[PDB]
Structure formats: C-alpha cells, structure tokens
Amino acid sequence: ELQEKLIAVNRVSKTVKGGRIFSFTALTVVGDGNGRVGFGYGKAREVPAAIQKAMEKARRNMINVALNNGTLQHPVKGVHTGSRVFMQPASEGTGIIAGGAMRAVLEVAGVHNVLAKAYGSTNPINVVRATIDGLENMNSPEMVAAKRGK
RNA sequence: AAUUGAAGAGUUUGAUCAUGGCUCAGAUUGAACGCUGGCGGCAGGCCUAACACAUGCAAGUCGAACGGUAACAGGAAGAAG
Numbered sequence: 001e002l003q004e005k006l007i008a009v010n011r012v013s014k015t016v017k018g019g020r021i022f023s024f025t026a027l028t029v030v031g032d033g034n035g036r037v038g039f040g041y042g043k044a045r046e047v048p049a050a051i052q053k054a055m056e057k058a059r060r061n062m063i064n065v066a067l068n069n070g071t072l073q074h075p076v077k078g079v080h081t082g083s084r085v086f087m088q089p090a091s092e093g094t095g096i097i098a099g100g101a102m103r104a105v106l107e108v109a110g111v112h113n114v115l116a117k118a119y120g121s122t123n124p125i126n127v128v129r130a131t132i133d134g135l136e137n138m139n140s141p142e143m144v145a146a147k148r149g150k
Numbered sequence: 151a152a153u154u155g156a157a158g159a160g161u162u163u164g165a166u167c168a169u170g171g172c173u174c175a176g177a178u179u180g181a182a183c184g185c186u187g188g189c190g191g192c193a194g195g196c197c198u199a200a201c202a203c204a205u206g207c208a209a210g211u212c213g214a215a216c217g218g219u220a221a222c223a224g225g226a227a228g229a230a231g
Contacts, residue, residue, distance in 0.1 A: 099159095103157075
C-alpha cells in the first residue's frame with residue numbers, strides 16, 4: 001500500500017581537477033492511493049543508490065490532499081519556479097490526463113480522472129513542486145464551511 | 151437529453167535553472183507520388199490554361215389560334231388488268 005514510482009533520473013557532472021565526475025539524480029514520488037503524496041529527490045554516484053535515497057526521502061515529507069470521490073474538487077493552479085500548472089476536477093472526466101511528471105504524482109496521489117495542462121517550464125523537478133503546491137492549497141467543502149461559519 | 155473538457159518530448163551547458171527559437175508525436179484533405187491490391191455499400195472526381203476546340207446530343211411545343219397538304223394511312227368518285 002506504499003505505491004512508489006520514479007519519474008526522472010539524470011546524469012549531472014562536477015568538473016574537478018582531473019577531468020569530470022558524473023553523478024546520478026533520481027526523482028520519485030510515493031503515495032498511498034488516498035491523499036498522502038510525497039516526492040523525493042536524492043542524488044548519488046550510481047543509479048540504484050540514487051533511487052533508494054529518493055524513495056527514502058519521499059516516504060517522509062509526505063503531504064495530505066483533500067480528495068473528492070476519486071478526484072479533485074475545484075480547479076486549482078499551482079506554481080513553482082518557472083513551472084505553472086493548471087488542474088481541473090473533471091467530475092469523472094475519465095482517466096488521468098496530465099503531462100509527463102504530473103501523471104505520476106497525480107497517479108500515486110490517488111486521484112483518477114482530472115484534466116491538467118502544465119504551462120511555462122516543464123522541468124520534471126519543478127512540475128511536481130507545482131502539483132503538490134496545487135494539491136496542498138486545494139481545500140474541501142467541509143474546510144471552507146469550517147472557515148466561513150457556514 | 152441536447153458542449154464528459156485541456157498530456158507532452160528532443161535539442162544551447164562540463165553540469166544547472168530560466169528565457170527562447172527549431173523539431174517531433176495528433177487530426178484533416180477535391181490530394182499527388184511509391185510499393186501493394188479481394189469484394190461490397192455510400193459519397194467524391196480539371197484545384198492548373200476564364201487556353202483552343204473535331205464530332206454527337208444539351209429547347210422545344212401547340213392544328214382545341216390560322217391559311218394549308220409536303221409526306222404516311224384511310225374515305226368518296228372515276229378509269230383499267
């Protein structure tokens with residue numbers, strides 16, 4: 001019931017004294033399938049150590065999302081660095097139809113059938129960060145009615 | 151009951167993030183070309199030279215408008231084997 005999946009692995013470099021030194025970065029997202037989404041970055045010298053650090057950071061640093069029946073509630077826009085992201089609840093608008101690196105976080109998030117369209121930059125490290133910010137500041141009808149009295 | 155509706159990716163760098171262009175994945179067509187080709191249904195078929203046109207048809211009808219008889223088939227009368 002953990003439901004982990006990796007989005008992006010890259011080879012970064014460092015350029016020391018004698019030549020270059022190549023390191024690998026993972027970027028994974030875990031989530032239970034009912035709210036509870038996390039992402040982790042993690043970087044290491046080989047690929048399986050990188051993904052393992054990424055999963056291990058992603059299992060902690062996990063955020064609650066106030067889902068609807070199987071989906072979002074109201075249309076929400078989350079931004080991070082250069083990466084602006086729209087989402088629309090699509091009240092059984094079948095299938096998760098999101099961009100790459102947004103399909104994954106929305107998939108393990110437990111949502112099933114939203115409409116997305118990322119704008120701006122679509123770097124995978126910043127398009128999540130713009131989905132969680134997004135799903136984090138999406139509030140439910142029992143939270144809005146809690147705030148404003150009824 | 152009559153709008154249930156939105157996906158990205160590759161490429162600037164030793165690597166990064168951003169900006170930014172180029173390019174790809176889709177659908178479409180009065181299409182052409184290449185390879186191949188069994189049947190049917192429904193549609194479509196000179197986008198260019200509003201260039202030049204052989205030949206055949208594409209606008210005739212009415213005698214219940216009229217003088218009339220060129221034919222065709224009868225009618226009447228005459229003459230002949």
